[PDB]
Design a protein around this nucleic acid. Structure first.
Lengths: 426, 94, 136, 79
RNA sequence: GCCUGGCGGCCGUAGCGCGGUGGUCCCACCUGACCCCAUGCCGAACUCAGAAGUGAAACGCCGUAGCGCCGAUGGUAGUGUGGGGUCUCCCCAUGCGAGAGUAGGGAACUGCCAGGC
RNA sequence: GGUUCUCCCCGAAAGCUAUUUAGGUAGCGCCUCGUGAAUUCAUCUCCGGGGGUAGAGCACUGUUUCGGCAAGGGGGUCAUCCCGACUUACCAACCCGAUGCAAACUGCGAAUACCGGAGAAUGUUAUCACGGGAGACACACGGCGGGUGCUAACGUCCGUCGUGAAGAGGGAAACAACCCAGACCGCCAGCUAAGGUCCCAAAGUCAUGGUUAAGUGGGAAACGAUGUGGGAAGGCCCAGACAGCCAGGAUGUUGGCUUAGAAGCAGCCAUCAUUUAAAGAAAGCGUAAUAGCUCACUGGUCGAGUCGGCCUGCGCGGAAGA
RNA sequence: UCCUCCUAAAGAGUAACGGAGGAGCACGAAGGUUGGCUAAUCCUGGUCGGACAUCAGGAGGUUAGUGCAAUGGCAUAAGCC
RNA sequence: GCUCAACGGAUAAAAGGUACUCCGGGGAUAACAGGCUGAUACCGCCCAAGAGUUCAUAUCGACGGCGGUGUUUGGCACCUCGAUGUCGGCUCAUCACAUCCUGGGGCUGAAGUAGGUCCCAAGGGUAUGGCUGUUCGCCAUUUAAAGUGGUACGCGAGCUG
C-alpha cells in the first residue's frame, strides 16, 4: 500500500532487536539507532528472560506493562522486541487496543527511510514482501470476513492458496527486478575494472567513521551524524597515490549489529561488487564494550558475501580515541605484512595508511631499475604525462631510475620474438 | 506620437464585444467627468504594440474618434487571462 | 507537505472547477509561471516544481508560491466495496483555473527565470507559460 | 463515527407575497425562527410565538424596509 | 424673516475624526438635600428644592474629505431558450446581466409645534 | 406459469408516506367513466413581491503567501532585570499595505423558477369538487445541476427535462433510451425535417475561394520537430545584407600553484591596445608541453535577401494484441 | 424516534451504509409584569495579585451572553439585576 | 402505568444448528466465465537532481508528469440460478509480438572473447527428472533456447479425478 506509518509518531521502547540470546546485553545499541529511527526515549520498558509463550511470546505481566506503557504514552504502535510468530502477534494486537508492528517491520521502516535509490528500495521491498508474507494470513482473515468465504468455484485449490500464489508471483516479479539490478551492477563492474585499476570497497559497522575515512582520503563531503545508516549510497571519487598511482573507493552500506540473513541476502542480490572487488577496505570499530562479538558477526557477514576472503585493509577505529598505542611507519619487510591499527577517521593515521597502500600493492624494496631504451624522450614525456615524479634523478651514463616499475610487462615487450641482431645488451 | 484611430461603437454588449474580438478589435471606454462617456473600438495589434512600451501608460495619449482629436490617459486595463491579448481599456480624459 | 495546519472540516466535497482564475497578474515579483489550462495540482507537484526552480537559480533571488493546496482529495483503498462512508483523506490539492499565476520570482535574470520556470513546467501536469511584470 | 442523521421540516418560509388578499389571521411567514429580519409593524403586532407573522386584519401584504437598522417589516393594509 | 427645545418622517451623500464658534432665550453642567425618592456603598446615576457661577465638558452650528458611506458608463463573470465542438469543459445566436474596481459624489434633507430678536 | 371472439374512444406508473416493510399491501399523486361549478386552468405581457443559488468577495468563521516591528517569549554577552548597555543580524502577536481558498463563510447578488393581481388572443372547460372502476408503488438511458466513486463504468443515489417503457416511420453501417417526426384506411400523386447527392444506394464527379500530402479524413496525451498556410511586430543592409571559403589573432599577457606542464589543460590573481581595413591575462573542443579550428574585422567581388521569437489554421512523430 | 447545518439547484420539498454535531431534559423560577442596566477584548496605575482575579480612567462597540447541539435570532433587547 | 428505543407499537410471553435437508421463486442477488471500467498491475514515453575519475542520457535513473494494454488484485451486478461443470495434469492445438534461440542492425564506459542497451523481424524451434494435488516455486542435469501473454485463467457430448 502507498499509505505508510506517520513519521514522528510516539512509540514505546520495549523493542530493542533481541535483548537476549542474540548479540549480547545491548539495550543502548538499539536505543541509539531507534532514536535515529525517530521515536524519543520518553519511557523505556525492559524485560529479562522473557518467556516465549505460545500465546503471546511474552508473559502477561509484561504484556500488561507494555500495554499500559503504550496507552499511557498514547503511542500509535505497540512494540515487541523479539521476532515472534504472526499468530502470537495477532493475539497480542487483539489483546491491545492498538496493533503491534514487528521488529523486522520497524527495521524495514528505518531502512526505507534511509534508502534514497530504487536499488536500495528494491532490496527493502523484497524484505518487506518477506515480512508481510509472514503476517499476511492473520491480516487476510479479516478480509475473508468481508469475503464470507466466497470464491469456492473457479480456483479448485484450497482457500488462500490462490492468494499465496499471487504473493509468489510478487516474489517472481521482484526476483526479475533484482536480477535486472544485478545486471546493471555487473555492467558497472565491467566499467570500473580495466585490469590495471585497483578498487577498494568500504565496509564495516555502520556510521563507524568509515565514511569519514573516505572524506579525509578523497576530500569529498560525506554525511556523518549520530544516526546509523547515515551513509548508504556508494560514491566513487578518484584519488592519487605516490606509489599505488590511481585507485578508487566505493562506500558500501555497512551492517547493523547482527544483520538479519534476509537483509544480507537482499543486499547481496542487489550488489555483487563486494565479492567482485579486488581489494577490500574494512573498517572495524570498537564502539561496543565487547568488540570481539562485533568482529565475529561482521566477519561472518563478510564471509557470507565472500568479501573477507578478499584481502581486507583493516582499519582499527576508536584506537586513536583511546591512544593506547600509536601508528608508526617502519620498513620491516618489503611486503610489510602488519595489521594496520590506524584510526584515520580523524585523519591521524593517513601517512601510515599511505605506507599501507604500499603494503597492499606489490611493494618490493630492492626495486631493480629497468634497462633504458635508446629512445628515452618519448618515455620521459609519457612519464610526465602519466605521473610526474616528486623527485627526478639521473644515474651515470644517462640512466633514469624511478619508483614506478613494470618489470614483467617490460620483459614481454622487450623480449618476446625480437631478433636482437644489434645485441646492445651482451 | 501615441495616437490611435478608434471607431465609435454602433452596437454595445456581450455579443458585440465577442464579435469585435473575433474581428480583431477590442472595446474601450473614455470617461471625462465633465461630459458623456464615449465607447470605442480599436485594433488589438496596434494597441498591444504600443502597450508593450511603458510610455503608453506614463504620459498622455491621443485618440482620433470621428475627427475629434481627444487627449486622454490610460486608467484601467483588462487583459485576457491565459493569452497575450487584452480585452478592454478604460480611459480618463486629460 | 504544504497542507493547512488547522482545517474546519476534515473532508470536502468534490466540486467542479471554476471558469477562470483570479490572481492572474504578477505582483510579488518580476517573473512568473501562469497556467494556461484547467486542472488539479497536487502538493507533491507544487513541491517538485519549487525544488526544480530553486536548484536552477542556486539560492539566488526569491521564489513565491502563489497557490496553496487546501482541497482534501479522498481516496478509497483497494479491495473495498462501495458505500460505507466517504474515503479517508489521502492528499491535498489546489484547483488551478486558466490564467492562474502560480510561481513568482525575482533577483535572477530573465533567462535564468525562463529556464527555472520551464523546469517547473515539466513537473506540473497543467500547461503553463512565462509571464512578466507590466505597468498598468 | 456515523454521520447520517437529519431532522425533517416541510415549511419554514414566507407564504403571502405582498399581493395576497390574506383574510383574518393568515400566516405571512411561518417558522421563520427570527424576529428582526422579518418583524411586524402594520397590522399592530403579529409574531406571537415561534415568530410566525399573522395578519391582524384582512387586507393586502406589504413588504418594506424601515428603521435605523434597515430591517424589513411585514405589514397588512386594510381596505 | 434669525436661532434653541420637543416629537416624527428618512435610515452612513445621515457617521466618526480635525479646527473654530455659542450663552444662564433654550439646553447641559452647576448649589444643597434629616423633605419626595434613591444607591447590594455609591445626592455616581434617580429624584426634589434652587440661590451664585460656567459654556469648560456635553450639546448645537460652521468650515475641513482624513476616513467610513454612496457610486455610474464601459468591460467581465453568470444564466433562460435554441444550436454546435462534446477529456472533466467551452463556443454561437438571442434575452437578461452581476459583484469587484473606476471616474465622480459626499461634511444631510424634510414636517409640525413651543420659547427668544 | 397460463388465461381463449371483434371493433371504437381515453390512457397511466415504476413516486411520497407507513408497514415483522423492502418482489406484498393501504392512503395520496397519476389513468378512466358520470354529475356540477366560475372566463375557473395554461401560454404571453405588465405590475407586486420574498430569497441568499450560480457568480463574486475576504468584514466575519476558519485557511493562505509576501513586505513592514517587538507587548511578551529561545536568547547575544546577562547567578548585568541594570528601575536602561543595545529591547541580538530569532519568533514581531494584535496591527498595516499587497494575493488567493471554501458545502457546512457573506459588508454584495443575478438568470431562472415560485407566488399574487390585471389584460387580450388561443385551447373540444384543459381547472376544481364529489361519486363508480382501476393499474402502479422492479424503472432504463440521454441532457443539465449535484452527492458518492477515480471529475471510473452501460456504476450508485437525488432534483429537472426528453425519450423508451406503452411509439411505428426516416437518419446514426447494424443500434429500446441519441437526431428528425407522432402511423384511421387506401393511392404506381406532389413538398419537406434530420441526414445526404462518386458506385453499392435515391439525389451535384455542383459553382466559387482557401487548407492539408497523412489515406489526415477514418482511435489516443505530455512531449518533440527548418512540414505547410496566414498575420502583427523586431535586427541587418548596396556609408554593401546571410552561411562555408582564403590572411591576421601579441612573446611585455608564457608569471606562480599536483615542477625541467604553467598558461587557456583542478584553482586563483588578469583583461594595456602599442604599429586597431581588422588582433582573446584565449570562449569551447583541445594539443605529449610544443600544435590547431571557429569567431571580434576588412577584399572576399558568391550580390537581395537573411536571422530568431509571438499568435493562428491544418498536417507529422509519439501510437504495440491476441 | 426527534432536533440543527450542508448536500438541496435564491418558494416548498428532495436520496445514499453522504459530510458534521445533539436530545430521551431543566426551572414554581431560569415563569408573568413593572422598574433599571448593558457586554467581548486591549492599554495605563495600584493589597501578601502574579499570562489570569477585586478596583479607577481611555480605547472597542456586542467581536459578549443565551440552562444545554447547530442555525436563525436578539438594543424596544429575548442578555443582566 | 410503554428503553412498546425495531420509537405508526405483531403477543402478556420466544435462542440457535442443518454438510441429512426439503419446497416455491430470483440472474430482482454473491460464486465460475463473459461484459463496462482500469484505481491497482504490466509496458512505454516526458523533465533530468545525480551515480558514473571528470561527463545527466554507455548503463541506471531522484522528486514529479503523460499515456498504452486488458494483463494481475479490485469496482459494478448487464447475461445465464425451468443448471454456462471447479483448479491441475494427459492428448491436440491456434493466435498476438511487449522476441528466449536462430536472422539483420545502431550506440557502447564495444581491443579480441564475452557483454549491456535499443531498433527491425513471428519462418521455424523453444527440455527430462526429485518434491508437492499443485499453476507455481525450489532443486539435479541438460540445451542454441528451455519466451511472455490471448484463446469460457484454450481443451471434462476428448481422458483423468
Amino acid at each position: 500500500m502507498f499509505d505508510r506509518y506517520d513519521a514522528g509518531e510516539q512509540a514505546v521502547l520495549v523493542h530493542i532487536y533481541f535483548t537476549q540470546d542474540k548479540d549480547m546485553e545491548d539495550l543502548q545499541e538499539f536505543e541509539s539507532l531507534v532514536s535515529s529511527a525517530g521515536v524519543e526515549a520518553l519511557q523505556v520498558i525492559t524485560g529479562s528472560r522473557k518467556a516465549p509463550h505460545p500465546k503471546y511470546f511474552v508473559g502477561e505481566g509484561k504484556a500488561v506493562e507494555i500495554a499500559e506503557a503504550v496507552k499511557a504514552t498514547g503511542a500509535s504502535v505497540v512494540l515487541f522486541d523479539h521476532a515472534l510468530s504472526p499468530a502470537q502477534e495477532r493475539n497480542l494486537e487483539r489483546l491491545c487496543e492498538c496493533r503491534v508492528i514487528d521488529r523486522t517491520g520497524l527495521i524495514l521502516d528505518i531502512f526505507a527511510q534511509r534508502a534514497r535509490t530504487h536499488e536500495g528500495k528494491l532490496q527493502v521491498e523484497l524484505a518487506q514482501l518477506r515480512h508481510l508474507a509472514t503476517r499476511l494470513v492473520r491480516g487476510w482473515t479479516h478480509l475473508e470476513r468481508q469475503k464470507g468465504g466466497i470464491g469456492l468455484r473457479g480456483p479448485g485449490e484450497t482457500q488462500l492458496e490462490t492468494d499465496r500464489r499471487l504473493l509468489r508471483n510478487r516474489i517472481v516479479q521482484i526476483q526479475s527486478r533484482l536480477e535486472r539490478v544485478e545486471k546493471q551492477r555487473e555492467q558497472g563492474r565491467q566499467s570500473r575494472i580495466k585490469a590495471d585499476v585497483p578498487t577498494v570497497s568500504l565496509v564495516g559497522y555502520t556510521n563507524a567513521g568509515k565514511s569519514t575515512l573516505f572524506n579525509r582520503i578523497t576530500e569529498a563531503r560525506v554525511y556523518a551524524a549520530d544516526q546509523l545508516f547515515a551513509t548508504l549510497d556508494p560514491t566513487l571519487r578518484r584519488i592519487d597515490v605516490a606509489d599505488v598511482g590511481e585507485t578508487v573507493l566505493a562506500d558500501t552500506v555497512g551492517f547493523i549489529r547482527h544483520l538479519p540473513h534476509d537483509l544480507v541476502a537482499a543486499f547481496k542480490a542487489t550488489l555483487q561488487e563486494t565479492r567482485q572487488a579486488t581489494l577490500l577496505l574494512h573498517v572495524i570499530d570498537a564502539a561496543d564494550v565487547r568488540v570481539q562479538e562485533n568482529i565475529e558477526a561482521v566477519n561472518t557477514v563478510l564471509e557470507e558475501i565472500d568479501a573477507h576472503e578478499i584481502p581486507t585493509l583493516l582499519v582499527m577505529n576508536k584506537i586513536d580515541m583511546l591512544e593506547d598505542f600509536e601508528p608508526r611507519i617502519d620498513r620491516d619487510e618489503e611486503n610489510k605484512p602488519n595489521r594496520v591499527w590506524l584510526s584515520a577517521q580523524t585523519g591521524a593515521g593517513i601517512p601510515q595508511l599511505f605506507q599501507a597502500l604500499t603494503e597492499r600493492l606489490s611493494g618490493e624494496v630492492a626495486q631493480h631499475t629497468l634497462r633504458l631504451p635508446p629512445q628515452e624522450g618519448r618515455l620521459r614525456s609519457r612519464f610526465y604525462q602519466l605521473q610526474a615524479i616528486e623527485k627526478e634523478w639521473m644515474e651515470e651514463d644517462g640512466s633514469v631510475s624511478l619508483q614506478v616499475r613494470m618489470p614483467i610487462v617490460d620483459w614481454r615487450r622487450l623480449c618476446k620474438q625480437e631478433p636482437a641482431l644489434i645485441d646492445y645488451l651482451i | 506620437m501615441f495616437t490611435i484611430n478608434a471607431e465609435v461603437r454602433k452596437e454595445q454588449g456581450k455579443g458585440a464585444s465577442r464579435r469585435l474580438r473575433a474581428a480583431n478589435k477590442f472595446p474601450a471606454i473614455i470617461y471625462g467627468g465633465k461630459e458623456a462617456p464615449l465607447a470605442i473600438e480599436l485594433d488589438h495589434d496596434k494597441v498591444m504594440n504600443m502597450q508593450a512600451k511603458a510610455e503608453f501608460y506614463s504620459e498622455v495619449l491621443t485618440i482620433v474618434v470621428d475627427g475629434k482629436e481627444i487627449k486622454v490617459k490610460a486608467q484601467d486595463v483588462q487583459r485576457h487571462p491565459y493569452k497575450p491579448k487584452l480585452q478592454h481599456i478604460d480611459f480618463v480624459r486629460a | 507537505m504544504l497542507q493547512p495546519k488547522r482545517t474546519k472540516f476534515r473532508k470536502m466535497h468534490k466540486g467542479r472547477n471554476r471558469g477562470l482564475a483570479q490572481g492572474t497578474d504578477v505582483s510579488f515579483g518580476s517573473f512568473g509561471l501562469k497556467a494556461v489550462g484547467r486542472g488539479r495540482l497536487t502538493a507533491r507537484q507544487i513541491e517538485a516544481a519549487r525544488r526544480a526552480m530553486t536548484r536552477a537559480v542556486k539560492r539566488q533571488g526569491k521564489i513565491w508560491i502563489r497557490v496553496f493546496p487546501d482541497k482534501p482529495i479522498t481516496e478509497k483503498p483497494l479491495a473495498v466495496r462501495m458505500g460505507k462512508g466517504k474515503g479517508n483523506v489521502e492528499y491535498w490539492v489546489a484547483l488551478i483555473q486558466p490564467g492562474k499565476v502560480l510561481y513568482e520570482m525575482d533577483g535572477v535574470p530573465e533567462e535564468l527565470a525562463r529556464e527555472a520556470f520551464k523546469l517547473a513546467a515539466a513537473k506540473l501536469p497543467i500547461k503553463t507559460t512565462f509571464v512578466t511584470k507590466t505597468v498598468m | 463515527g456515523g454521520s447520517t442523521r437529519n431532522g425533517r421540516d416541510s415549511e419554514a418560509k414566507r407564504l403571502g407575497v405582498k399581493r395576497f388578499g390574506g383574510e383574518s389571521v393568515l400566516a405571512g411567514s411561518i417558522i421563520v425562527r427570527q424576529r428582526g429580519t422579518k418583524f411586524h409593524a402594520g397590522a399592530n403586532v403579529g409574531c406571537g410565538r415561534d415568530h410566525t407573522l399573522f395578519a391582524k386584519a384582512d387586507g393586502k401584504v406589504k413588504f418594506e424596509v424601515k428603521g435605523p437598522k434597515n430591517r424589513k417589516f411585514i405589514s397588512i393594509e386594510a381596505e
